[PDB]
Amino acid sequence: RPDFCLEPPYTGPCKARIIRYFYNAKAGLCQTFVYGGCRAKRNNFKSAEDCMRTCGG
Amino acid sequence: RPDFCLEPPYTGPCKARIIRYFYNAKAGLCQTFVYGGCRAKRNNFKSAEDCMRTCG
Amino acid sequence: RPDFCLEPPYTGPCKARIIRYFYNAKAGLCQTFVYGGCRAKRNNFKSAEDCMRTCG
Amino acid sequence: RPDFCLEPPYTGPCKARIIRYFYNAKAGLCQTFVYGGCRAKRNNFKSAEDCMRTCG
Amino acid sequence: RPDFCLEPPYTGPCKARIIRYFYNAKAGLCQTFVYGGCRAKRNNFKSAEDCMRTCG
Secondary structure, eight states, X not given: OXXXXXXXXXXXXXXXXXXXXXXXXXXTEEEEEEEOSSSOOSSOBSXXXXXXXXXXX | OOGGGGSXXXXXXXXXXXXXXXXXXXXXXXXXEEEXXXXXXXXXXXXXHHHHHHHO | OOGGGGSOOOOOSSOOOEEEEXXXXXXXXXXXXXXXXXXXXXXXXXXXXXXXXXXX | OOGGGGSOOOOOSOOOOEEEEEXXXXXXXXXXXXXXXXXXXXXXXXXXXXXXXXXX | OOGGGGSOOOOOSSOOOEXXXXXXXXXXXXXXXXXXXXXXXXXXXXXXXXXXXXXX
C-alpha cells in the first residue's frame, strides 16, 4: 500500500462538510471523515471503492 | 442478523448532517438518522437496501 | 391514493436540511419540503417518481 | 419558450441551500441558483439538461 | 487549453457549500473548491472528468 495511506485524514481549512473516505491503517479498513472542500491530501477518496482498492489489502 | 443491528443509531462527534439508515430492531425495519461524519458504529448504512438486507 | 398522502409534510425534530417530496392533495402534485433526517411520516419521498406513483 | 422561463429565480422561504438551474433570458441560457427547499416556481430545474431543453 | 483554465476558482457570493472542480494550471490537475451556488466563472466543473478534459 502507498505510504500516503498511512497519513491521518485532513479536513482542510475550507467550510464544506462533505463525507470522504480515508484508510485507517490501524483499523485496517477505510472509514469516513468530514472533508472541508479544498486542499485535499491523498488519503481522501470520493468513492469508498477507490479507497479500499488504492489503500486496502 | 448480526448483533450490531440491535444497537441504537450513533451520530458520533463530527458535525456534518448526513442521512444514514439504521436497523430499528424493535420496529423490525430500517429508519433514517443523522450521522455526523466520523466514528460510525456498524448499524449505519448509506443504502437502505443494504440496511434491510444486512440486518433483515 | 393512500390516506397518509393527505397528511401535511413533517420536517420532524432532527437538524438536517434534506430535500424530500410530499404529495400535495390541494395542488394535485408532489412538491418539495425540508426533512430533518429523522422520524419521518409517510408522506415523505426521497424520489418524486415514488411520490407520484404512490400518492398522485 | 414557456413564459415562466422569463421569471427570475425564486429561492423561496425555506432554509436549505440546494443547487438548482433556472433559465436566464438576458444571458440566453441556464445558470445555477440557490433554492431553499420549498415553494419552487417553474423556472427551477433539478437537471440542467431539463432546464436547457425546456427553456432554450 | 482554453484561456479560462488559467483563471483562479471563484466561489461567488451565494451561500451554498458545494464542491466543484477547477483546473489548477500551476499544479497540472483539477482540484476542489467550495462554490457558493451562483455566478460561476468558467473554470468551474461539476464533473472532474469534464474539468481535466476541458482544461488538461
